[model samples]
Target chain A: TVTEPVGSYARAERPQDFEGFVWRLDNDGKEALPRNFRTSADALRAPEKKFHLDAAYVPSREGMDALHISGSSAFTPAQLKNVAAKLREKTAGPIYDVDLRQESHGYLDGIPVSWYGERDWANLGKSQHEALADERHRLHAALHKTVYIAPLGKHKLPEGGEVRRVQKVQTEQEVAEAAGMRYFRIAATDHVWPTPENIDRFLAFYRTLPQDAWLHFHCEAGVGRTTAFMVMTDMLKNPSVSLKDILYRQHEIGGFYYGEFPIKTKDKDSWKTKYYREKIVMIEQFYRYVQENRADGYQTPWSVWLKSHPAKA
Target chain B: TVTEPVGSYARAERPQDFEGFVWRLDNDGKEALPRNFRTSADALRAPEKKFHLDAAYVPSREGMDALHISGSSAFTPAQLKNVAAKLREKTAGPIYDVDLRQESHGYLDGIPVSWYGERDWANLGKSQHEALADERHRLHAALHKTVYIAPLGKHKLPEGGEVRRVQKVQTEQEVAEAAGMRYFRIAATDHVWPTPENIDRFLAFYRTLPQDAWLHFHCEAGVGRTTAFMVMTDMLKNPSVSLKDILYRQHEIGGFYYGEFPIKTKDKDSWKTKYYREKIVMIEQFYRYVQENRADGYQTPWSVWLKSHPAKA
Candidate 1:
């Protein structure tokens, strides 16, 4: 099966921290494939932590599966049919085709869940058609023993679970840790654009991980921030790559690393000097030593690893 | 009969008002003459006022005949004898030597005058020898009728007379009306220094007079009030004199006409242009008129008169 990178939960191989768990998902396609579902009750009874799949569905091979769904009541009747067909094809067990089109009353994993459907429909009285739609969605959810309801437009995470606001310094640290995550996609909020603070945070995070660990980072468009982070990580890990090569890769991935951000070539040069150049030399040497002697491998001390090689200008 | 100027008094003639009276005097081979006299009666008199002749002992082939004498009690015998001898062959009048010299007081035409001789004698006190010497001086002043022995300093005119303190403007008018005054002398309680204000006032006075009137103007050596007055007056009357002529005459009269007192001429051409080439035209024309016609046997105007011309440049 050709598996496009999983856009679902994936755990780190040796989850030492939240960052590692996030990285495991981000880098899943490169070295590891995530399990399709959580363990059964017997597996859950064991001490090992396992994440359960509450609902499963695969996109339709023909026709639009569920295009441009918006608000809480995002799925139409046709989209619902498509979803039900894909779910039936993907899993042997019962699958939920919760219709959140007209209203949001449904169930997930035998748990009843209700939400105000699209805010636009809230003012409409309980007409038979709306009530009927909600009933059908709930029945479908019950049959599959799964609750898959869209969140209400006003829905938010539980109060305490919401991310707390932090000062710039703390935010930078958090972002740095996120960048170092061994699994899971590390996406930044709009506030954390690819500024020096964000770049530094990403660099700090990348440097802390073992060479084998992978990290992925992105922002809204996955252009500026993603490209910058990738190039910076490459410079730090594979210092043998020339700046030209790094720039080529950056542009190939996202047109321009900095894109419309007001940084110039000179500014990039300065960043390379201040953050990447010296560290890159060390990283390059480390790579060289590893490639030369697989036995020496990860055993190379950081100091010796850094001194053994110098970066190609 | 050899008649000298002897300071003759002449008022402005014809259409011209009595601008002022001119006192023309000559050396006349007599005693060095005082330019002015102090006599209350002469100051009080109208036209042809006579200044007091302290002692009129004209020397000739005959013995001295003192026309008037008033001896004081301070005369010494030897001093009296010396006076008689000095008058015997040298004067053509009787010597009416009086002994009023002892009285330690004298007058000029009844005006109270202070004599330096009395001041000197007063310092001698009651000492017999010094008193005797003092007595001789007193007799000389009283007995010598032809010799002027005013009880006041030179240059001081009597105060309460037609010759009273008048505004500079009026003075200039009076001088102009009298055809032209022989001298332009300004007096104040202190030295009559021609400050800018004084110069300005005199210039205003001169502006009212006819151009021809400037020829007779003169000033004596003392404070330069008169010279400054002349310079400004000439400048207004004849705007043709070149800078060189103006500066040359100004220097000759010891007045700061052009070179120093704020205005100056540095280059030879500027000097030529201002005084000779331009402004001096009027003065030269006036002179040529006098010279060609032998007007009043034209002679060089005094330094005071020449210094007044303005430079065109």
Candidate 2:
């Protein structure tokens, strides 16, 4: 069995009091890991604790009131209320919870597990198709049940502890809606770019949103995917700004510049190069899309134009 | 006269409520600029506000308790007290503030300014030599005075507001000592590496500090110089870890990877490429220094060994 190095900073060992998620399956008996999860859960139970996550706010820009970036979050009924209140204070109007997680996660082993099936799906001796089938089934069970049992079944907890059974109350989106914030989902992954179709789908829905609605984008670490979407949106809004300038400016704040300069090696290019290349290209194309379709150019919505002029299939 | 773009995110235009420093000379009458400074100063006056900075902790590793990273900070007598209290709770014993700034700055125009003389130094009629002379004289004045006049002298404030004269209560280090934290300074500049002699100076002093003392490093934005020193310190402590891994992991946290893959432009090497290349080489040599001098190797202090085997002049 493969195991990530225990308690390594590079791996997901956060501070004891940090209220956020990282990619970690087993904690190797570290107190901080379990304590952090409990803290997050307790924040949900006791609304007075005032839910805090690893999050940052990008200052308001032209055409956008403000932008918030954070790691993937799982909110409970009461916890969502507190988060919603905070978002209300930040934005001028309504809130849009733009979730940028492609992976399926509902409840696992009675805990609010996120990025589920990412680390351990392959180890279970199931085909990709079968694993995806399981993900849909798991999500269906979570949403339908008022309360349903979940067998721990040898699954590893962040604290390196396991339980036999657990219960689920509501899906994440269900809690989000109950708290009076709108939820938007995107199918995106780490080290990968969203498809042109996915971008069009988002922008199409984005155009219909109220002009004053504020957006908060999130992924696992809130570094790659979150930054990418923020950059794309900035490109969509500010067509005249160069992609390099937008990326460079975004990085001046907390977001990682996915469009950073490339790495060149003599032999075959590394995955870092390949991944970054695709990300830059994706944003560059999006920039061109805006320039081609906006009033300064064609005066048409990108998604509408994209549908008629389909990509080279 | 040269002026940096006002209100650009890349040019020290932090969030309205952000409590930290970036390199900005003028604010172009922006409201957020003054509000942030006032907020930071108020956090000091009212200790109950709890003095927040743009800071993060790199988890504890072997031979080190824990590492804290943050942007360059100016703490008041009360603010330093709050900061010290937080550090006490995080570490096992004493606190060490490893300040990584080569440029000179003190209270300028009645405000706590940082990275001074960097943006608009040469634009003044003074040469580099004259600038250093002024810096030393200015620092001397800042230190000895219980209260002294600082003429606005046509200098621009972050708020773009200025006054003819203002008073300073105490130097930053004076307040730091009053709040019970040891201060260590390093002569390191952005996009530049410290000399081998300077590194040895730090390591030699590092050996004298208590084993349980916690270290908090800060540079402007806590990205380039701060991350570079943190990587160097980690190399000093964890000799077995690869430089690549150290940089990759540091970047996983909020630290900018100065050791990121380089950019190769054809006609002439860009300053970015040149700067990054030197940074990598500097850290790599430090890594080599550790492997050669540790008990596992030559069993001599890096500084002592270095003095005898000097680099070519």
Give fnat for candidates 1, 2 and onward, in order.
0.00, 0.00
CA RMSD (A), model 2: 18.4
Model 1 lDDT per residue over B125-230, tens place: 2233444444345434444243232222233322232122211211212222232113232221111222222333344444344422312222221312233333
User: In candidate 2 chain B, where is summed lDDT lowest over 10 consecutive residues?
Assistant: B39-48
Instruction: Give candidate 2 regions above 4 Å deviation.
Output: A1-313, B1-82, B108-110, B118-136, B140-159, B263-273, B296-313
The residue-level lDDT of candidate 1 at A77 comes to 25
Report chain A TM-scores, every model: 0.26, 0.60
lDDT of 2 at A52: 17
Candidate 2 residues A1-313, lDDT tens each?
Answer: 3242111111232222222232232212223112111111111121110111112323223332333333233433454466567667665677777766555544433244443333322213333344346456655654533432222233332433343333443444665677787888775544456644457667776677775666766654336777677777777666666665566556544566555342443343343455556566556656767777776544565555644544321
Tens-digit per-residue lDDT, B245-278, candidate 2: 5665555444555453535654433534555566
Provide per-model DockQ scores.
Answer: 0.00, 0.03
Candidate 2 residue A152 Cα shift, in angstroms, is 26
Clashes of each: 73, 0
Q: Report the C-alpha lDDT of model 1 over A207-312, residue by residue, as the tens digit.
A: 4655333232322222333444444444445444455444444443222332112222354244223223323332334344435544544454433343444234
Chain A agreement with the truth for model 1, given as TM-score? 0.26
